[PDB]
């Protein structure tokens, strides 16, 4: 698909069998989801955003279906104002910026 | 052009006669530039994200050139770690997300 930017580029994703709404975010190196339980072990990690650093739980090799396209990568879970799909997963589905 | 996401999508922009490097961010509602003394009247405001909120100065109708493409809009100046071009300016240069 081709998505214009008049509205936040929010799309439905499937993860852990659940359906969620997430922002396609070219300015995020990582994928960060609001607190939820994902199967498997996690490791404490810290990441920075515009307002500072937060602590997150890191889950590796998690399959995520973004608008029908499959990706399997690292997903961070922590206090984010919105679920964001970052460049680590956007590259797997072949997302590019065009103008 | 077409920009892949293997690396952060950084491009050269021009504002206030200055040439800069800024991240094209589909996950930013606004444009936020690192601390700089632009002549002009501004209004204070707060924007947030991962980590919380930061105080920024809002400047309106500022001419901004993004990789040869002209745009004009609101620019926020504040203690941001990176210069960020948000949707308010990306929509003006016809930028789309494609996959």
């Amino acid at each position: 698909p081709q998505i214009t930017l008049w509205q936040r580029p929010l799309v439905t994703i499937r993860i852990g069998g659940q359906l969620k709404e997430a922002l396609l975010d070219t300015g995020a190196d990582d994928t960060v989801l609001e607190e939820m339980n994902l199967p498997g072990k996690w490791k404490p990690k810290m990441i920075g955003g515009i307002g500072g650093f937060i602590k997150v739980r890191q889950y590796d090799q998690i399959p995520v279906e973004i608008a029908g396209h499959k990706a399997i990568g690292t997903v961070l879970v922590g206090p984010t104002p919105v679920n964001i799909i970052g460049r680590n997963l956007l590259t797997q589905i072949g997302a590019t910026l065009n103008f | 052009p077409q920009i892949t996401l293997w690396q952060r999508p950084l491009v050269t922009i021009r504002i206030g006669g200055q040439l800069k490097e800024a991240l094209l961010d589909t996950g930013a509602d606004d444009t936020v530039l690192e601390e700089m003394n632009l002549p002009g009247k501004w209004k204070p405001k707060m924007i947030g994200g991962i980590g919380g909120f930061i105080k920024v100065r809002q400047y309106d109708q500022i001419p901004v050139e993004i990789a040869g493409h002209k745009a004009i809009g609101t620019v926020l100046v504040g203690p941001t770690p990176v210069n960020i071009i948000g949707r308010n300016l990306l929509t003006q240069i016809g930028a789309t997300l494609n996959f």
């Binding site: 990582d30 | 924007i47 991962i50 948000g86």
Partner: peptide, 5 residues
């Protein structure tokens, strides 16, 4: 990682 809301 920048949302900017």
């Amino acid at each position: 990682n920048x949302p900017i809301v």
